[PDB]
């Protein structure tokens, strides 16, 4: 590592809304990150919703119900 050219590299404490907390080295001067994302990926859920999204014959039968 060279001395003076690299930015300061500090410990941090990352917190999400649910409180699931992370401790890392980072570049932030604040020493913390107040984030809205945790290790709760929505791809698993988003993908399911997207899969669920198609199919309209049923919807048509809906309007008529008969």
């Amino acid at each position: 590592m060279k001395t003076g050219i690299h930015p300061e590299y500090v410990d941090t404490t990352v917190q999400c809304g649910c409180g699931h907390s992370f401790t890392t080295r980072s570049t932030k001067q604040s020493g913390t990150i107040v984030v809205e994302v945790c290790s709760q990926c929505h791809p698993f859920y988003t993908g399911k919703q997207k899969i669920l999204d198609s199919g309209g014959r049923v919807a048509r039968f809906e309007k008529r119900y008969g």
């Binding site: 060279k2 050219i5 690299h6 930015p7 300061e8 590299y9 990352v14 992370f22 401790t23 890392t24 080295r25 980072s26 570049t27 932030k28 990150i33 984030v35 994302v37 945790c38 290790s39 990926c41 929505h42 791809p43 988003t46 993908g47």
Partner: protein
């Protein structure tokens, strides 16, 4: 901290389970990340002189390294190039910088991108290296969202000791990196 967190779990769990999955029969064949290099764009060289210092600054404070400015091998005429103009810088990460960058992006950068469905498993080379595209930026909470006029994108490469490709799929699957069949 003796071990970075991703490496805290890598030094026991992913290695023991990857031996479970693949019977190499020899310890120290088991595959691990070598370097994580980050691939600075631009292409505005010749067209605009000022921005590349925007990219030097950009690579820095996403991770704390001074990106080394990488320039043109040759002047190729159509896309205005000139031998020796700066066209994007890159930063090579290895060790504590590699792992702290990885865990942070993993638990920070990947979830935020709008409509971020996943990452393709297909994007390996012949030998177990994974590269994917960050089109805009401001996936990172390191960059203040009003400091940032135009979006500078980048490539991020994970380079492993994976002699195959499903080796690297298996590592980067067990390592907390997303994918989507």
């Amino acid at each position: 901290k003796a071990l970075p967190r991703l490496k805290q779990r890598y030094r026991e769990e992913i290695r023991e389970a990857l031996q479970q999955e693949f019977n190499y029969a020899n310890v120290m064949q088991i595959p691990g990340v070598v370097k994580v290099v980050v691939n600075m764009g631009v292409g505005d060289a010749a067209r605009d002189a000022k921005l590349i210092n925007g990219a030097i600054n950009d690579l820095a404070l996403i991770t704390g390294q001074k990106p080394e400015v990488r320039r043109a091998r040759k002047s190729i005429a159509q896309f205005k190039l000139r031998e020796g103009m700066p066209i994007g810088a890159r930063v090579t990460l290895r060790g504590d910088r590699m792992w702290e960058f990885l865990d942070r992006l993993i638990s920070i950068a990947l979830p935020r991108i709008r409509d971020f469905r996943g990452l393709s498993p297909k994007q390996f080379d012949g030998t177990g290296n994974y590269t994917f595209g960050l089109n805009e930026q401001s996936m990172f909470h390191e960059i203040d969202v009003d400091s940032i006029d135009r979006p500078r994108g980048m490539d991020i490469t994970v380079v492993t000791t994976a002699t195959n490709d499903a080796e690297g799929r298996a590592l980067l699957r067990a390592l907390g990196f997303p994918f989507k069949e």
